[PDB]
Amino acid sequence: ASPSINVALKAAFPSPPYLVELLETAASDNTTIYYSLLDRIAKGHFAEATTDKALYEKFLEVLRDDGHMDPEALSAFKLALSLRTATPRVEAHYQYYTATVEPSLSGTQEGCDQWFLIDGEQYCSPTLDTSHGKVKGEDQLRTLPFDRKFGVGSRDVILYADITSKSFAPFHEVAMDLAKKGKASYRVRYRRSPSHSRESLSVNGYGVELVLKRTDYIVKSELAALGMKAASFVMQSEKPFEALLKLTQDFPKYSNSLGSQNVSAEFEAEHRGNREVFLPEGSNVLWLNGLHLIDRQIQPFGLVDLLTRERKLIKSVLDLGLTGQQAVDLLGHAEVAHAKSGDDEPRRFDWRDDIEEGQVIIWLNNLEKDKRYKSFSPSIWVLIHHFGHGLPQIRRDVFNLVVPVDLTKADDVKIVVEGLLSFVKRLIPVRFGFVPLTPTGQAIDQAKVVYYLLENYGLAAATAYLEKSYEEQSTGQPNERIFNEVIKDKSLRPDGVELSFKDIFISEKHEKQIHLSKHWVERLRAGGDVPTVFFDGFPIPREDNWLRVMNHRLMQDLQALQQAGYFGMLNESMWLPGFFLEKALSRRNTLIFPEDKNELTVLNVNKIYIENHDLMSKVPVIEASKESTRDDWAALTVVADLDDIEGQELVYYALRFRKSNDGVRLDIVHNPKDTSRSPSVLAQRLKSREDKLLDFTRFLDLETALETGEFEPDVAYDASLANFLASSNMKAGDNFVILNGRVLGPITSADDFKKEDFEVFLQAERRTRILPVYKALEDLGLDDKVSGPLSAAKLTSVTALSTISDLPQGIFDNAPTVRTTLFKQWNSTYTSFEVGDASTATIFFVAVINPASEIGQRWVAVLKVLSELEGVHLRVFLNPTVMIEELPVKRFYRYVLSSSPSFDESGKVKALSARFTGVPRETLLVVGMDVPPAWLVTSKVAVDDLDNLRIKDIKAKRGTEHVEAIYELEHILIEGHSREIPGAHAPRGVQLVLETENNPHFADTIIMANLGYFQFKANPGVYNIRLKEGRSSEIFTLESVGAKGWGPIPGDDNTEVVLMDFQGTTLYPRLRRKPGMEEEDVLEPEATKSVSKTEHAEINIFSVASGHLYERMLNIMMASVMHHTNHTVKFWFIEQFLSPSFKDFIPHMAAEYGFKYEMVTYKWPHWLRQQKEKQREIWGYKILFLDVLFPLSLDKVIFVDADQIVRTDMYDLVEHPLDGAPYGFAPMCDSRVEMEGYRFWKTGYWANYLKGKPYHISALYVVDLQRFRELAAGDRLRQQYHALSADPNSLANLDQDLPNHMQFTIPIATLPQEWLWCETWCSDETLKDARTIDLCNNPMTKEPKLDRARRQVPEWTKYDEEIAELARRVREE
Ligand SMILES: *[C@@H]1O[C@H](CO)[C@@H](O[C@@H]2O[C@H](CO)[C@@H](O[C@@H]3O[C@H](CO)[C@@H](O)[C@H](O[C@H]4O[C@H](CO[C@H]5O[C@H](CO)[C@@H](O)[C@H](O)[C@@H]5O)[C@@H](O)[C@H](O)[C@@H]4O)[C@@H]3O)[C@H](O)[C@H]2NC(C)=O)[C@H](O)[C@H]1NC(C)=O
Ligand SMILES: *[C@@H]1O[C@H](CO)[C@@H](O[C@@H]2O[C@H](CO)[C@@H](O[C@@H]3O[C@H](CO)[C@@H](O)[C@H](O)[C@@H]3O)[C@H](O)[C@H]2NC(C)=O)[C@H](O)[C@H]1NC(C)=O
């Protein structure tokens, strides 16, 4: 009605049938709901629903009536159905079917609408008599992400069906029954149904913004009160949530309208008592049950997935009679969070030689007897009376450091010789030791050599051999030429026991010493890929700057000694290192104590005993004792292959451990490697002997009990068994241990997990997870709700999962995964308002919004729709700032989202749009899309200039006050963060190729230095990532694409990526270097040009335009090139900054002028610093992404500005020698003399910085892309831009200023000035020899660009007329 603007978004793929969408949305994770519904529709039950509304209506009654959903879950189903979350999941099936099924299915298909696939044979009938084909191509038995399985069976059957028709129902029942019998396992895959049309999909869950492009006009500056008055207006209204939405959506319009009718109502200067304690004014912060959410997680898709995960967690808890409110309170409790932070409590391991009889550690020091430290006092009070920054001097043994070193490796040897000795020489009060690593023959020999040389001759002689050997010989294997010289002089007085010389094979020296050393390394797991250093029994892995970390603990240990001294705990007759070893463990388990602390897996216990009840009621169970306490209670489950020694060894130890601990409740799950013989037999053998369990005096009693007895197969048991392992992601024949939901394994050798190792696992686990749950729980007085070991495990397991990081630490935010309760302190009467019932709510939201913020605009819109869900509680806090330097909100905002689907008059599903009403007639606006992270969007239909919108002009020109535009969700991102193995660094310069069965080259990108970042533009389907052929595959092998998580998670040893969601795909790939390489991709160890020219063109020019004029000028620029060269040209454009009017026109320009064109884009990385102003974005696209924006096949490109015109045959620029420089620019004209005043690059900062170098122009330049990438110029530009950008007034014009700031670091080839002309800075005499002309800014005039063109260049009109006639010719065509 009022003058309005309407914007809609549609996907790049057609809308799947509504029926299949409801099936998938309804049965999210649950297969039972899936096939239970698949039965209902195969009855022909859902055939009477003629329309989408009716069909949707029928599902609601069914789900409620069959017990599938409750109100909470039904409300959530409607919102997820609005979002159309299941549509990309269905399109995954179709892309897979179109690209891998159809080309591998040889024959003539007609009548084969549905067909099972069995043993590479296709059957178009349920009767199964005839096989049409032997299917070619790769295996279709890939158990892949979108699959579902029904039943267990030796044979595997797949049905590719078009569910829509009733031709489907008989096929289903044939395999449903065959799976019910157990003959084979059933799974359904989809077929694109021809009953549905090729209508594109209308999407929602995005935002639209109308940005004011002129903010320059402000006079009166009483901005300070806006946030404060805006906050009060809402509190006053008494319909507060609606006020905020209405105010926040059209905020720029209401600025002057605020401050009316004694408006301040500052009761709430009182609630800065709230500010005083916790958050600073004007900051937006959201919490979900204590969890702090980052901005990227605050979209509809991100939020729906969080509720889904959180409810599953809470529901499990409230089956013990806890309210949603009590449950959440327990999760964010102080004692709980303290335990997570409780790795300030360090655990130490006993580093001593005492077990290995003193023959393994070779110390470089003794502080009590070295006559270096002779100066120092051997008194305790020296330690206690210390102040300052210095480390206390003392003649006593107090601090120790043992570093395991490989003597083959020069890097390892250099550590001892340079690193360790400097410290000795420096007179540090730390004793330095080292133990050789013996993983190769050469290493073993050199340990012998060095050990011998110490034994008879002494430390200096051994030291001497190492020092000598390192310098140049850098010996892998022992060298006599160097060894014998050492003895020749250093063989003076080799004391005590006599020499052997040259040859070592001493029965005791080789055996005892080397094997004792191996026993030490093994005992503390101090070896492998990454060795482990032990400082005071504290493991520090040998990586990056471990000394930095060691020094940190050295100061933290010193302060630990001082405090004991002031309490008089210490005494003069003491071994001070033993203060730390008091509670140290002799053996170190990498399973329990992984050095990457994040490496942890916990399962929902409630889930395990709900889904697999059939299995868990039939496993041999030892219930915990009747006379045992809540503290003693713990639940253990052992998963082991009883067909292997390791598997049965492990169980005997678990049984032994149970005799000792009466509080434990044990379960034994037999997981065999071979499932051709039923697993139920060996389980049945033990459950008979269950009563007599742990009366096995000896191990053979268990061995014998497993072998004896005759049993049938419970095939029901077998099925639930295989389901459990699949749910728990466990391999067959692999050993695992589960105490209170926490899984450790796979156990390679049962010697790793002994009786003593179960006791520690319970000791440590108990501490962290069980004792903080017990305390916290009791503090709230909920300690009546724990009724047993299994009852307890459900609570402890759930609260450990609550503090689980889904997003790896260090990527999106460094801050740890901790639930705060710190906002509960805050008074709420005058700043807060709540929505939803707290008593019933399972979800609790705490929003802290600043009304004056632009981020608040989005937050309000999304929160209102999620508040509409049943079982959700929200509480809002408004916190504005008094510090407002500039206008706070400079845009209008609308969020396209509904809490339940909308239907047509003809019953179809309604599409959703952003409609802005009551738009000011004379304000200039810019349309922008506030799209979820994974999405790539461009304008498809629009007749207006979306960069320059004004209603008065449109009304005058078109006659309409109403504007309509349509966008397209063209691509969805596959983005990931790489790392090298084992010394994890980002592998920069690595090239990647994305592929599909149809084509082996979907896309290509290069790995960046920052987070090993990379991205691909794709849509739903099954893909694969291969390292690009060349140097990348030569140096590396990629073990995995981290699709499962950071991991390594077992089963992720793959390179397969699939996208079936609107959140795209986030990956954490891993790459390990090939045999002994220190090589770099960027550096070579020839037909590189020809190739690009053949594929693309003789000339490759790229550009960008942000307005109808600039697009009109761009048409002229391209034409001028074409008239001026009889060569082949390819034009490249930055896709998203162009209008659809321009986009729709170019094929007609390409036909006329005879050139090729290609649209390119890259999404601005999340880590890289954004640009609020679009003009600045555009400049960034020209300089920051040059290496990644164009395909690797392209040798070189040339940038030409839109306003330019060229009289030259452009090849010349290609041939121009750049003398090994990545890119070439043209300098600023010095020819105009009278202009000097406006030459600002002869001033202090630019003349000081550019000592002799020129001030270049970014209107035209060459980029030798192959060299650019080779030199890794892009990553420097990116990181310097990010660093420089922290200062807002940094780069006036970043495009010109970044290459000029980087010309010292990155060479710039300077171009002949024949290459550029501009009236402003070049003389009129110069134009005769000019090659190209930029229309640079006035600035001594106000004459506009249209005027300069016609006056400056006479042939500009000739070009404009040619374009004008063709546009009219197309309009009439
Ligand atoms: C995956 O799939 C399914 C479906 O979403 C989830 O589990 C379903 O939940 C049903 C209950 O809501 C369950 O019904 C149970 O039937 C068994 C007998 O086979 C009963 O022993 C159970 O009793 C428990 O639940 C009831 C709930 O109220 C029920 O009472 C009326 C009585 O007239 C019943 O007619 C009706 O089923 C009501 O729901 C409690 O009152 C009891 O005290 C007791 O605790 C259930 O009634 C279904 O068998 C089950 N499957 C389906 C297809 O519905 C499953 O949890 C979900 N899991 C995941 C991982 O998502
Ligand atoms: C939340 O609102 C309450 C409202 O009262 C604020 O309470 C403050 O509490 C202290 C004492 O707890 C009050 O003053 C002191 O009281 C004692 C005993 O009556 C008296 O002996 C002292 O001399 C002193 O007067 C204080 O006045 C009161 N504040 C106000 C404004 O009344 C609380 O600080 C608020 N907190 C937040 C986070 O906003």
Ligand SMILES: *[C@@H]1O[C@H](CO)[C@@H](O[C@@H]2O[C@H](CO)[C@@H](O)[C@H](O)[C@H]2NC(C)=O)[C@H](O)[C@H]1NC(C)=O
């Ligand atoms: C590109 O090739 C064409 C030949 O097709 C050249 O065009 C000739 O130019 C004169 C200009 O007065 C015309 O009168 C002739 O009729 C053209 N020849 C033909 C065959 O029609 C053109 O000059 C070449 N341009 C460049 C830059 O190489």
Ligand SMILES: *[C@@H]1O[C@H](CO)[C@@H](O)[C@H](O)[C@H]1NC(C)=O
């Ligand atoms: C209250 O009302 C009017 C402005 O609406 C003004 O006359 C008066 O100064 C305002 N403030 C106070 C404290 O009375």
Ligand SMILES: *[C@@H]1O[C@H](CO)[C@@H](O)[C@H](O)[C@H]1NC(C)=O
């Ligand atoms: C104090 O001296 C005693 C010997 O009298 C000895 O146990 C130890 O060195 C000190 N005591 C403790 C508890 O460490």
Ligand SMILES: [Ca+2]
């Ligand atoms: Ca320009």
